[PDB]
């Protein structure tokens with residue numbers, strides 16, 4: 001029973017090197033193909049009652065993964081790679097634009113989308129739950145989009161903005177979700193309580209980043225003439241900061257591992273010199289790639305589970321499927337809404353954002369596994385004793401987040417190719 | 425509860441980079457210090473009833489790891505690194521000596537040690553169980569010894585022999601253990617059945633190695649101008665061969681991942697050229713190092729658990745502790761016995777083995793985690809419905825294998841320094 005999982009990890013990574021050997025340089029990028037293959041395996045095991053004898057058991061184990069673990073195992077090997085592969089040149093001039101786009105943006109979007117669904121969805125949802133789903137659907141991780149913006153070699157400003165916006169969006173999205181979750185549970189909040197919660201959980205978590213950064217930079221300076229330990233040290237530090245933030249200090253872990261990666265991007269030269277700097281990057285690249293292959297295939301599996309696990313109960317009558325496209329058009333309308341509201345500030349701050357770059361920011365709102373963890377968090381709570389939340393409500397969120405994950409990458413991610421190559 | 429484990433992984437790897445920054449170039453090598461720190465943490469959590477609030481939960485989760493999983497997660501990242509870092513020059517001339525030392529050797533040792541304990545141990549053990557423990561205690565993995573034999577730069581022949589002997593010893597030790605386990609369960613064997621079991625489980629598993637090797641060498645040849653996928657491919661192939669051997673074809677996995685690593689050591693040049701060959705090694709080095717830091721600390725934790733989990737029941741009256749040194753002196757006497765019996769063959773075959781190298785082969789019988797998995801296998805069966813095996817019998821094996829693991833590394837591994845530096 002335990003080994004079936006090691007089988008699935010191996011099979012999923014082999015599917016990764018197939019879909020990268022093929023589908024490279026073609027018009028169909030990596031991530032969309034990964035997610036489709038994941039949905040394929042998930043459908044083959046769950047839907048087909050014949051089942052698969054060995055792989056199927058491991059697929060089922062990985063599909064029942066706990067969401068907190070789903071974040072803890074993977075994100076510290078994704079956010080760190082992103083925050084480390086960026087450069088100081090652009091970050092110090094784009095920081096104004098991304099922080100202005102990833103805290104106010106998510107507040108606006110959450111407000112809008114939450115209101116929208118509660119008004120036009122007959123499932124008898126309430127304001128807190130609807131704003132809860134808004135906070136869920138407010139994260140962004142356009143991996144395919146940054147991949148293209150480096151493949152076709154566009155301006156680096158757009159790429160830096162669109163990465164950091166995704167990072168600080170994942171962070172503040174988890175923060176707003178946690179707030180609305182405490183709200184749904186029954187905890188009452190006043191203005192001071194909320195302005196203390198957000199302030200601490202954002203800015204206090206940010207400090208842990210550089211605390212660990214300076215400590216581990218000194219300890220990288222003490223070590224002489226070595227590369228293997230220095231790299232394993234950085235890896236262990238990234239993996240320990242996430243736990244020190246999410247479970248020890250009751251603060252956000254994404255901003256912690258994000259402030260730790262850019263601090264390393266700032267002080268890489270003092271700690272690593274010669275070939276040691278070059279190897280540091282290659283190793284981290286693999287950890288990224290592996291972590292990228294497994295996250296997308298697993299994601300697909302999960303979402304397939306979420307459609308078929310209770311297929312008799314829901315995801316059969318077509319009315320739910322129409323509401324799913326309604327929520328989709330609601331998602332981009334709010335993205336458009338956020339960028340229209342924030343256009344003047346984004347204009348004067350940093351380097352000027354022209355209309356076309358604003359057009360790419362309207363696109364590239366691809367959803368990521370970070371919100372899959374949150375949807376699965378709500379469903380796990382709903383199955384257990386819950387107040388206001390009921391199992392069918394968790395049932396709903398799992399398909400709605402999963403559907404927007406599939407729809408955004410297949411449509412927004414694939415057609416991003418057309419806008420940059422021909423229209424621009 | 426799940427995150428406590430990610431905390432322990434991070435903490436254990438940080439302890440690794442501490443014990444390697446210190447204790448490097450000193451007379452106290454890496455592995456012994458790792459194992460002592462592991463025993464320290466295990467003792468602090470289990471013995472001290474005060475407990476540790478967070479780390480302790482993760483320590484307990486990792487200490488309750490299933491043995492089959494304990495092998496499957498780690499060994500494919502250890503045996504492959506070993507079988508890949510070796511060179512063709514020596515392997516083709518030492519192969520005769522190691523195969524002659526790791527199949528007949530283990531048969532001799534198992535026979536001797538099994539008989540010895542059954543004769544001089546009053547616990548009312550039977551011949552099958554005693555030979556079972558003999559097969560347990562017949563594995564070797566002297567990591568510290570190969571580390572020294574490369575640090576002080578001795579002849580490569582000794583190093584190659586002493587690595588491959590450890591590899592094929594792990595393999596054939598697991599094979600003999602499985603045979604004696606089927607025996608203990610109740611399955612009856614005749615001469616033909618045994619000569620079929622061993623033949624298939626050894627030589628048929630050996631074929632899977634090169635099947636996967638040639639397949640993955642062709643698929644490394646199709647891919648052009650790339651490094652990240654080629655390396656992730658090799659990793660995934662190593663991790664899938666273990667499962668294809670141990671659970672799909674009912675054969676040994678150690679010889680499979682071992683024939684896959686040397687085939688790559690043979691055909692590295694055709695598949696990887698330029699910097700891609702150099703990076704391939706560095707990445708694998710880390711996977712080795714990490715896997716080496718976690719295996720030893722976890723091992724220590726486990727053995728500490730095995731002494732204190734039932735401290736009231738056993739490991740308190742001194743009589744058991746005396747039998748533990750008796751078994752220790754029995755262990756080296758059989759090592760001496762095996763090499764004395766195999767001396768003439770080892771003489772003429774390959775390059776001549778002189779008396780001093782035979783003296784180092786008498787030493788360097790350090791026990792490894794490979795036999796920890798087997799001891800934990802017997803205990804898990806003993807707790808459940810069992811025939812002939814009873815819980816106290818599994819209770820015994822766990823301390824006896826664990827004690828010989830601690831005693832061999834602290835005594836045989838540390839004093840190996842003295843023999844090579846001054847006596848030779």
Ligand SMILES: CCCCCCCCCCCCCC(=O)OC[C@H](COP(=O)(O)OCCN)OC(=O)CCCCCCCCCCCCC
Pocket residue numbers: 061062063064065066069073074077239287290291425426429430433
């Ligand atoms: C370099 C990597 C560093 C960190 C790696 C992980 C650190 C320790 C991992 C131990 C976690 C497993 C503990 C456990 O109980 O597993 C069960 C898990 C969750 O499923 P359950 O719902 O059954 O949870 C039971 C608890 N209520 O069932 C599962 O399906 C578990 C699957 C996930 C386990 C971890 C997989 C490792 C993947 C390696 C690649 C990571 C990216 C670099």
Ligand SMILES: CCCCCCCCCCCCCC(=O)OC[C@H](COP(=O)(O)OCCN)OC(=O)CCCCCCCCCCCCC
Pocket residue numbers: 001002005006009485486487488489490493497498501663711714715
């Ligand atoms: C690059 C790595 C490739 C392969 C990595 C692993 C592949 C998939 C891992 C999933 C396995 C976890 C599944 C599970 O149920 O975990 C529980 C595990 C065993 O403990 P239990 O006795 O509770 O087992 C329950 C079943 N009866 O409880 C535990 O304590 C689990 C601890 C071990 C989990 C794996 C840790 C990963 C370590 C990464 C480093 C590996 C070396 C490179």
